[PDB]
Design a protein around this ligand. Structure first.
Ligand code: H9F
Length: 1218
């Protein structure tokens, strides 16, 4: 994929002309990883990594020679100064130009100040000065981009080399260091601490071109306006600390919101997760109250932080006005006079040095501090203790064989008992050694010592040959199954087909789409544990070393395939292979040609299976121990009157900005047309200060008002969205996962709260400044309106042409970045397997090929943005040229003030135009947040919580519940679930439910609570359920859910969230489940704050809590579901006895998976695949041998069925015959 950057000229590499073809393709179709362009040979990850590693090794070597700490920063500087001195040369040129061009502005204006139409010599000199002005702006606009590319390229190169050394080191970490670190800490300095290098370079050069320029400019100012410059200059310096006390006060209001944003997001997580429980309990007004309180207390801090941000941005807007105003007030007051050449040079000098001092120099300071911190982190990571490379082997005679003598080892230099105690045994070719021992013996550590991963303390280990190893936990990397097996070995058809058949892989391959070519990412997302183990075994077989180690291979797989693998591969294929096995299944020990027993780190006995049969020790004995979106985003914030006032306030701010400099222009003109006489100073300074103050106040007012309106729009959108997600029917929560729903509450509203109202105000600010500049140049030279239409059409078409590719290549440098982190993860988790094979260097090449695929989209993201900015500055330079020259070919009409104003504003168009366009892109990029928030504010809604027909207070009087032809569906057009459900429930009876899993057992609760408005009728005490609103239907029915949940809060809440009960009642209820005592030993009485789902509580305890809830509600209906799944039998019978003897006079339906739970129930639904068929007393249904109840009783067993039938008969005979 050749790179046209390689075959291009200089006249082609300045205008990035090599990149037009890609853009053309980008205009037709979408871009893929083929359309991309490969990288230069001077940028492949391997080359940079090798070079920087060379310098880093030299530097640490000299550190050892000198006994002082090695510094990575010195290595980076030593490898990169020779190539970062060139870019310094050019930024020196660029700063000199930004300082020179005001002086030629001065000379042009000075020609206008002494206009004489006949002195054509002066006209020719002024034309020369304008030509020099356009040369300066054309080296500031066209040759500043073949520079910025390389300044970002030095940062790219540094970062890619750093990533390569980081992976290289993390591939050879000693286990002692490996354990003390993590694998989240070795991806956090490759995803977030090696990105700083992509940015520090961009600004590094301003640590010396920042101050130097701020002196050069000062000197120039001194030559023109004299001492007064200091006055103005003083103010500029004050913007350095004031900018860093809007930062150590905004960072105290921005990390005092996380303690509220995260509370709200966590409460979201609980509300969205357990929404079926909240709806069934009819609680969501409580969570609505909680979330309203949290959201209001984060809007307080969002509103303070945004008011402060707006004040900062208005200071940035009006700083230039205040500098110029104080400069020229001091300039005039010391007794000098205003002429139009010094005024509009000094303005431009202040423009340049303000853009450097207040914006670029502090940014470079921040970014160099961040890159130094990151270099320190990678510095520490590169000094972790390594692994002894496999050293000079003892001279052998070609006998591949394993022998260990008197081996003792520790995993810690502080452990008392050694991991191994003097182990001395061996294995030869063809001898399938095996290890037998319960968990805690050290067999895993035994194989680890075999691999050398455990440092020998005494004895000796002699392993001579290629080693194939299998970890206890199978490990799969990002790649296809054939590539998974090959692990770098070239494919061989027969040697792979025998692998396929001996591993019994055919079933799994026929399951998946690509046969054996299905791509398997990290953690085996496309595989199962048995598949992982089998593919790991296949890798071990195909790598085909001498000595093989197999640790617990067959435990997690089926018996037959495990037998096949052990017999026709381990017993058969490996009978000619050195092998060590750690096992847990006894049947295979007969096939072990040797047996090793390990215990307490000490050898117990070695021998064949026969000698341990004769030993008298059975193994088991040992083994046991669009535009509409903008309109909706703006309508929410305020009514349109405030919006029209907002527009007038923007316009007043901009117009007063422009009119201040216009006032200097008019002042200068009124000084020229003079004469001693003087000029009335009080009037002029009065209006000058009036215009400056109007600029400042209108800037502050515009910024605060825009922030307030957009923050208020965020608040209104969130309140609407949330109060419309609490009312969405559970069907919606089923369609959308928990991840996406709670993503538009944390990330999206996360934008809408603090990044639209800042990007959308910055965009408005600089857009109105661009319009200010263009309208000044059109009010002076009206003819400019003609060429400036072919700089509107060209601009719009340019931006369309460019955003159709900068949106196809700013997703390629994102969807090819993750594979780097994924490969790093998959290689650290499989680390022992990798380092067991001598092929760790091949994983280095895989990392590079995953890093020459992100440094291949960073290349395009760095040069397509430049192909855009070169052209934008061609447009801005055409404008500056037209203003500079067209101000002369019409010299007869203009004057010094008009020309100064028009020209210096055109000079500031540079850069301001580009920031305006960049924010336009970013705002159109973050209105997707608003589009999603507004997509949720328009969801479905279940029936309203209240109806006109409120129920009688005593209702339900008894508990009569009648199902009349209830036909219920989960979703429209789906399978009919309950079909003609016609049943009667007379007061207080206990009705079990029987059926198949999902055959309608758990749908009766779904329809009875109207979780999906059912078809049919349900009468609760002769009242239709559909005819009453929900919270007058769910408040009057209790339920015991499958998995109880406790909602984060005081235990006073998880029982009485509405504060409708009193401490005596709560204590009594908790007593009825006998857990009252179990609570009154916690820090608080009830008010112990809890973790998720009451993690300090047990499942049985949670069930007790919900049973207490049911007791507290004391309504005369009740529904139980999945009483005890795996709860301990004591708590089982506990809950059972409270279930009967607590709720005798409260109608009970029970939906249980077992029979003893429901054997004694008064009646039983029988649900036949979504159909009620049998419903009567259990004894009657057992009388008929053909009843499904009889059949499913008989399916348990003989003694079980006899006991159950006896119990049902006992109930019948005690009940119906007194
Ligand atoms: O109203 C100023 C807002 N801010 C401060 C907010 O944090 C701001 N930040 C910039 N940066 C952010 C990212 C790291 C530092 C730069 C930045 N960068 C450029 N440049 C890149 C143009 O594409 C010039 C360098 O090429 N130009 C800027 N202007 C803005 C318009 C008037 C003056 C030119 C500018 N402004």
């Amino acid at each position: 994929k050749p790179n046209p950057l390689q075959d291009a000229n200089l006249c082609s590499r300045v205008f990035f002309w090599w990149l037009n073809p890609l853009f053309k393709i980008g205009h037709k179709r979408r871009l893929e990883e083929d359309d991309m362009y490969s990288v230069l040979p001077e940028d492949r990850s391997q080359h940079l990594g090798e070079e920087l590693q060379g310098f880093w090794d030299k530097e640490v070597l000299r550190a050892e020679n000198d006994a002082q700490k090695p510094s990575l920063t010195r290595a980076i500087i030593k490898c990169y100064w020779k190539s970062y001195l060139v870019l310094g040369i050019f930024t020196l040129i660029e700063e000199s130009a930004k300082v020179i061009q005001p002086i030629f502005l001065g000379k042009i204006i000075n020609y206008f100040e002494n206009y004489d139409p006949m002195d054509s010599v002066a006209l020719n000199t002024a034309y020369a000065y304008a030509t020099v002005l356009t040369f300066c702006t054309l080296i500031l606009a066209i040759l500043h981009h073949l520079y910025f590319y390389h300044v970002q390229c030095a940062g790219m190169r540094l970062r890619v080399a750093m990533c390569h050394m980081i992976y290289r080191k993390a591939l050879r970490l000693s286990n002692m260091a490996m354990g003390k670190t993590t694998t989240g800490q070795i991806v956090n300095l490759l995803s977030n601490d090696v990105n700083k290098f992509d940015q520090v370079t961009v600004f590094l050069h301003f640590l010396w071109a920042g101050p130097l320029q701020a002196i050069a400019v000062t000197a120039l100012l001194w030559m023109e306006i004299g001492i007064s410059c200091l006055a103005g200059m003083a103010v500029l310096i004050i913007l350095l600390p004031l900018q860093s006390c809007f930062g150590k006060l905004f960072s105290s209001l921005r990390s005092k919101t996380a303690t509220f944003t995260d509370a709200r997001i966590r409460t979201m997580n609980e509300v969205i997760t357990g929404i079926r429980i909240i709806k069934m309990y009819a609680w969501e007004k409580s969570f609505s109250n909680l979330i309203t309180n949290l959201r209001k207390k984060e809007i307080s801090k969002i509103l303070r932080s945004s008011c402060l941000r707006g004040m900062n941005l208005a200071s940035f807007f009006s700083a230039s006005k205040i500098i110029v105003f104080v400069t020229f007030t001091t300039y005039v007051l010391l007794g000098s006079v205003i002429t139009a050449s010094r005024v509009f040079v000094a303005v431009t000098l202040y423009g340049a040095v303000r853009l450097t001092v207040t914006l670029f120099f502090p940014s470079a300071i921040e970014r160099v501090s961040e890159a130094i911190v990151s270099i320190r982190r990678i510095q520490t990571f590169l000094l972790l203790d390594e692994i002894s490379q496999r050293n000079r082997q003892l001279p052998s005679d070609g006998k591949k064989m394993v022998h260990v003598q008197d081996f003792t080892a520790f995993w810690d230099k502080a452990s008392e008992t050694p991991t191994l105690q003097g182990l001395s045994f061996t294995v030869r070719p063809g001898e399938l050694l095996a290890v037998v021992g319960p968990v805690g013996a050290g067999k895993s550590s035994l194989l680890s010592a075999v691999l050398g991963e455990l440092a020998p303390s005494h004895g000796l280990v002699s392993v001579h040959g290629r080693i194939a190893y299998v970890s206890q936990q199978p490990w799969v990397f990002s790649g296809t199954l054939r590539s998974n097996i090959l692990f770098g070995k070239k494919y061989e058809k027969e040697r792979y087909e025998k692998v396929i058949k001996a591993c019994a892989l055919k079933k799994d391959l026929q399951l998946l789409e690509d046969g054996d070519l299905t791509v398997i990412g990290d953690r085996g997302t496309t595989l199962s544990g048995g598949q992982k183990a089998r593919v790991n075994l296949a890798r071990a077989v195909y790598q085909d070393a001498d000595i093989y180690l197999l640790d617990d291979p067959l435990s997690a797989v089926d018996a037959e395939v495990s037998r096949h693998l052990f017999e026709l591969c381990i017993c058969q294929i490996l009978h000619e292979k050195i092998t060590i096995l750690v096992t847990h299944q006894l049947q295979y020990l007969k096939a072990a040609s040797q047996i090793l027993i390990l215990k307490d780190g000490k050898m117990v006995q070695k021998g064949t299976y026969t000698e341990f049969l004769k030993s008298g020790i059975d193994f088991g004995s040992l083994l046991k121990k669009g535009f509409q979106a903008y309109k909706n985003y703006f309508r929410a914030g305020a009514h349109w009157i405030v919006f029209i006032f907002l527009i007038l306030l923007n316009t007043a701010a901009q117009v007063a900005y422009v009119l201040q400099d216009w006032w200097l222009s008019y002042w200068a003109n009124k000084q020229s047309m003079l004469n001693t006489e003087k000029l009335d100073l009080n009037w002029y300074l009065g209006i000058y200060s009036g215009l400056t103050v109007a600029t400042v106040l209108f800037g502050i007012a515009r910024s605060l008002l825009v922030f307030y309106v957009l923050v208020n729009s965020s608040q209104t959108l969130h309140n609407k969205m949330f109060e419309s997600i609490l009312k969405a029917p559970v069907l919606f929560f089923d369609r959308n996962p928990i991840g996406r729903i709670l993503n538009r509450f944390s990330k999206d509203i996360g934008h809408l709260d603090d990044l639209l109202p800042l990007t959308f105000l910055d965009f408005i600010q600089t857009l109105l400044q661009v319009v200010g500049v263009v309208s000044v140049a059109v009010a002076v030279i009206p003819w400019i309106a003609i060429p400036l239409v072919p700089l509107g059409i060209i601009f719009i078409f340019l931006r369309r042409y460019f955003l159709e590719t900068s949106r196809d290549v700013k997703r390629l440098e994102s969807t090819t970045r993750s594979p780097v982190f994924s490969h790093l993860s998959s290689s650290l988790q499989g680390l022992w397997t990798i380092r067991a094979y001598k092929a760790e260097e091949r994983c280095q090449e895989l990392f590079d090929a995953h890093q020459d695929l992100h440094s291949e989209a960073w290349f395009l993201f760095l040069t397509t943005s430049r192909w855009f900015a070169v052209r934008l500055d061609a447009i801005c330079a055409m404008f500056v040229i037209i203003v500079a020259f067209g101000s002369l070919i019409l010299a007869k009409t203009l004057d010094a003030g008009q020309v100064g104003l028009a020209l210096s504003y055109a000079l500031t168009l540079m850069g301001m135009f580009q920031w305006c366009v960049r924010q336009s892109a970013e705002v159109e990029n973050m209105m997707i947040s608003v589009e999603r928030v507004i997509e949720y504010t328009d969801l479905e809604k279940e029936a309203p919580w209240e109806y006109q027909k409120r129920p009688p207070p005593a209702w339900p009087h008894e508990g009569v519940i009648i199902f009349d032809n209830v036909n219920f569906m989960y979703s429209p057009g789906g399978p009919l679930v309950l079909k003609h459900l016609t049943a009667l429930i007379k007061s207080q009876e206990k009705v079990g439910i029987v059926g198949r899993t999902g055959a309608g057992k758990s749908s009766l609760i779904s329809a009875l609570f109207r979780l999906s408005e059912p078809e049919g009728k349900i009468w609760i005490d002769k009242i239709l359920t559909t005819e009453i609103g929900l919270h007058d239907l769910r408040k009057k029915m209790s339920i015991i859910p499958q998995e109880p949940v406790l909602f984060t809060g005081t235990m006073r809440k998880n029982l009485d969230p509405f504060n409708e009960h009193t401490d005596e009642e709560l204590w009594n209820a908790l007593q009825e489940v006998q857990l009252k005592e179990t609570i009154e030993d916690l820090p608080g009485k009830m008010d112990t704050e809890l973790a998720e789902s009451g993690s300090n509580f047990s499942v049985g305890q949670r069930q007790l809590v919900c049973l207490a809830r049911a007791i507290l509600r004391k309504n005369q209906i009740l529904i139980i579901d999945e009483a005890t799944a795996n709860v301990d039998p004591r708590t089982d019978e506990l809950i059972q006895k409270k279930i009967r003897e607590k709720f005798a006079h409260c109608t009970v339906l029970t939906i249980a998976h077992r029979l003893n739970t429901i054997i004694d129930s008064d009646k039983i639904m029988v649900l036949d695949s979504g159909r009620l068929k049998e419903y009567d007393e259990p004894y009657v249904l057992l009388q008929n041998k053909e009843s499904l109840f009889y059949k499913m009783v008989q399916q348990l067993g003989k003694a079980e069925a006899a006991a159950l039938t006896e119990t049902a008969k006992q109930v019948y005979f005690k009940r119906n015959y007194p």
